[model samples]
Target: NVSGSVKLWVDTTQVPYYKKIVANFNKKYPDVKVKVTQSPNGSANAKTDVGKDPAKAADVFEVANDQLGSMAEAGYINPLSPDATKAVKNNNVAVASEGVTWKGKMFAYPFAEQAQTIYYNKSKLTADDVKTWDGLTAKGVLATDFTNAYNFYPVFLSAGTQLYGKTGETVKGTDVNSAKGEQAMAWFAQQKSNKGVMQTSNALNQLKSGKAAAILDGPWNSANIKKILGKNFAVAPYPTIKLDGKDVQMQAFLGIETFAVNSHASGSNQKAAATLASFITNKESQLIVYDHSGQIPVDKTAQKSSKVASDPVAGAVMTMAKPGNSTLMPKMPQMATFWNDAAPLINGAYTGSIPASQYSTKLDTFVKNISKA
Candidate 1:
């Protein structure tokens, strides 16, 4: 029997639900001890939280997939063993498998998936109108943050451009500086004059006030919106946007919520921590996670559970996760560089600080800079 003391960092409010998972794990490994801690700022900020002091970070922790690549190289996490790797690959959707892999190895176990969807006031916008960007804005304003790269970078992908390549794993895969790229920038320039589109840091605030009828957001804010919009709340996959005269799927970044075994744990009990990571992320646990929390399930079997299958939020998230609809955030280590540099460029375009005439030159410099090792 394996025995070890393992510390787990889960979302602040999710700690109670994790205890049920802990109860189940104890049956399998009665000798192991698990102390659950509320993550400092939730899993989304795990990169900065863990990196601040990897040596003392939780022995098992939740993290977003985009940050996994950097953690793997820093000696902070251990890649799963071969059998565990095979199970994760075979049991989950392909994108979930791809989300946790780095340098050809599975470094984390993904339990939940996220993709932004259009949350709108059902009373103001018809189902047919939300299907296309032109119709949605013509009837209702969309309040969204232009400063967030995760929100706008995919606008380029709608122009049929590629970032970090089709596989999202290679430096050579980037091609955002093309004519297609400038076409996306042109849309950003045009967005300034679109009174129908409102640029705001707090889109939810705008939606709450009824100044805007819709906001592009994720499931994380679903409960809050439900309280705000009440019976009028509705969810839909991203509406199509017109790019270069043709309507294309307006994309969002696919996000995976994952848990990893810490390499810095007591060496004698690393295996125990691995088993804890494995047990809590399996099919049964993933279903439990979906049942308690509305986080979309990444496990194929979990997603098929009756309750999960019937959910409108889950339906919208699953629909948007499709390849043609969303760009999976690449796990390339250079992604750190991407977030730091891409934002100012995207925000600049949206703010008219960068003119349409220089879109090509600015993109060339942005593409080359972020693509560097």
Candidate 2:
């Protein structure tokens, strides 16, 4: 089964991982050939890419997790072996293992995790580093603004508000009118008193000046940060912030991606193709993917391996996405109102204008206003 040549499709930018993985996979299989190529129109639309004609597509191709259902239903992907499913479920996070499942069986191998993290200056803090909010400020300042709702609104999620209900439907199904909502409000208000947390319209300037030793940002700013901080820039997941006297891991919104094998491989070749799919996503291969592509690995051990665990950037954000530590951004249409209302609510709390007595009132009204059709 592992003897024939197999075509594997991935994003052009991700070519490096598969190239290295193919070589390593060859070491285990006696001369099983694998060709890596850029998926036409990219992995994001692997559905149409493979649907065009499975007869000609790569035996293994990558796809966003959401596309699995239609791809499986369309008969474009084969369910992985029991060993593959058991191995993934045993060794990785639910999102990695279950994200690949279709028809109650895993249809793919998880490929990557995407999320945000804290960017810091390496020279600061003999900082030796700790993972708590207060510890972050012990020797350095964190510059971040609450106006960007995506970065801070998720505290509501951490405080237990389910924005779009269980299915995330576009409906009147949000609830922030609870003591939990007040907890999030209190955390925001308390931030103003934390000497280590600084408010800056331009965190990059303050970080570059050493006035702000760290900032809450995403990978979008990584290149600029590295260029600005030179060799000293560092990245880590959101630090645990004190919420109601107990430390809670701050949340971030992230997405997962997976790779599937072609069902059209006619059963006989399925075993070898599935083997290649699983091989390229194993711990070592995931690390290589992380090493060259910077896409965080979703494997439990891979994310914790010193190579990933100690990674200045990718690994930190990957762990930042552990199920409870993060959430998916909802696709509800009310997002328009949610965004408009959340910014001011945060700004109100941060500036001390919103008193504690009015926290629930503000939260209830905010929740009510956003649930409108």
Candidate 3:
């Protein structure tokens, strides 16, 4: 008993899996209907689609973490109600709830965790070769024997850049340019000047080409890495550091692609959409979707399914979720500006975008500029 269409738009690359998920959803809610539309994967165009018209805008959209604030202001989305907490309780990490709660109400519901982990070429080091930054750099392992870009930053993070900073937010901005961030960046800049330890462009390439050791990247890169390095690669937790004279776990980025309901949609359609979203993301679906995909489950309980237990890759993700390793992703609107201004600054420092010595001053200005932006 509906009038118009309710569209569920997903990235084209995810269409196959989405279709299967939709079919599964139908098995549960056979009455209320939905049509799936594919947006070209990774295109900025998807964000634009949500703004044009209510009919064109997805009833639920997968929003990028950084751009989420803009979407909120643009009136493209609405917050989830208190009842949504039922989904929050089911997730393993409180970080799941962390994503949806913006200003206290739920803005999005995470179906996937976007935590970051360090990766390395196992062939390059023995268990004892690079246990800690001092052990790695003091041994001249990275400065001489290393040529990978991704592996280079870990040294800096280990020697000093606070691998983990914490704030109880799902989205963050400039807070990353903290004292620890600067300390680590200073060390990173120095290492770059010293040469042989880092190369920005070619690290992942070198890892694949057999010329590099490690990289600090997200799980999204795993497929591309597998394409290059094959099965020889291994994943490791972000190496830890001492903060305030105590061992502090590096903060893994606690990110997720979420399903958010439109506050504007109402009545049975709204309930059906919410129900469908919950259905696809439930423990049962987590078991099915991640069975062969290697993605982390949003639900902690669902992780116990036999498929996750049997999958070595999924096991590694679970193993890495040690106490310190699990934390909320930074959630600050200013953080976006910090990263935007900082990436170039950091890259500039790496390639002499500005004098290495001037980085601290430049960063100070950068932080201030972002705060004002």
Candidate 4:
């Protein structure tokens, strides 16, 4: 029996899953003590604290896969052992594995997957009405918050702009100033001028009030939107936007939560931490998360569980995340610059504050700012 203490840091919302896992893990290894605490800032805490003292850092902690590169580069997290890597690959979905794999090594155990979709009021619009961005614009006003970079870039991504290179470790510099990028910005400018979009505080409420036909958001908003719209609540894939004469689906960056072991753990501590990490992301644990938090499980089998199959909204989201329709959120530290650099540009684009004449020049400065990271 392994006899040592293991500390786990997880987001407050994830405490339930970890508590249950700890209890169950105790039954299998009673001598191993697992202490679970809420990681208020999640990965950021581990990054800062672990750098100060690796031994004092949580033995196992939860973090978005996007943080993997920085953590690995700093030698804060341990790479998964081959057996642990195999267990993760065998149990989790392919995309989940891809997200946690950095520099050709499995660095974390993925637990949840998330991406955005079109949430519409069925009584206000038909499925065909949202098949294309052109069609959705025809449905009067579309409700969405463009203040955030993540919510703002689908249209740009649909036009085929590369945020980074293939491996996510290198920066290719932002392409928002490219010819296609300008075209996408021009479309946004025209849409704003036409009053075809709403970005106010009540944008989503506009959908509920029937003032807007649809809201572009992720699953986190589904429950509340469903509650408000009642029979009218509907979800579908992000609508396609015609680019270069081809109908291209608006894409999103997929973010995943994963458990990562600390680099300082050794021998029995390493084994215990890895065991707990693998155990919590396994099929059974994934179902627990799906059942309690409505989290989308990364385990292939757990995703097929009855609970998941019965959720119409989540099912649509999964469909929207199909290969080629979504790209993994870049894991490099360079991504940290994206939110800051793109936010104001997107906000200006949505508000019609940035003149169409300045699109290329403004985007050039924004791209240079992002390349700084």
Every candidate's lDDT: 0.87, 0.77, 0.55, 0.77
**For model 1, where is the 10-residue window of minimal lDDT?**
287-296
Better of 2 and 3 by TM-score: 3
Candidate 1, 346-370: lDDT as tens digits: 8888889998888889998988887
Model 3: runs farther than 4 Å from truth? 1-4, 37-55, 64-70, 133-181, 193-206, 221-231, 240-251, 262-272, 309-327
Candidate 4's TM-score reads 0.84
Of candidate 2, the 10-residue stretch with the lowest lDDT total is: 328-337
lDDT minimum window of 10 residues, candidate 3 = 143-152
Score residue 39 of candidate 1 by CA lDDT: 84
- Show where candidate 4 strays beyond 4 Å: 42-57, 137-141, 166-169, 191-196, 200-213, 220-230, 242-247, 264-270
Model 3 lDDT per residue over 1-373, tens place: 4233355766655666667787887776667577876753442233456655655466655554544554565566666656766656556456666666666666666666665565666677544644454444443323221222223333333333332233433232334355655555555455555533555444566666565566555555655555565666676655554444445455444566666665567777777767666666676665555653456777877666676566445555655554445543434555445445655655665556567467567756765666552
Angstrom error of the Cα, residue 321, model 1: value is: 1.9
After the best TM-score superposition of candidate 2, give how far the Cα of residue 142 lies from its true spot, in angstroms: 13
Q: Give the clashing pairs for model 1.
A: 165-173
2 versus 4: better TM-score goes to: 4
Residue-by-residue lDDT tens digits, candidate 4, 1-373: 6767788988776687679978887888887879999864665355555666777778888877877887898788868889988888888889899899888898999988878788888887888887887787776678767677777575677777777654555675457688788767766666665566776666677876788888787664566677778898888877787666678787876778788998888888878888888877778887777666666888888788777888876687687778667777887766556667787887786577887788888888887877764
Q: For model 2, what is the alpha-carbon lDDT of residue 228? A: 82
Models 1 onward score TM values of: 0.93, 0.60, 0.75, 0.84
Task: Say which candidate scores most in TM-score.
Answer: 1
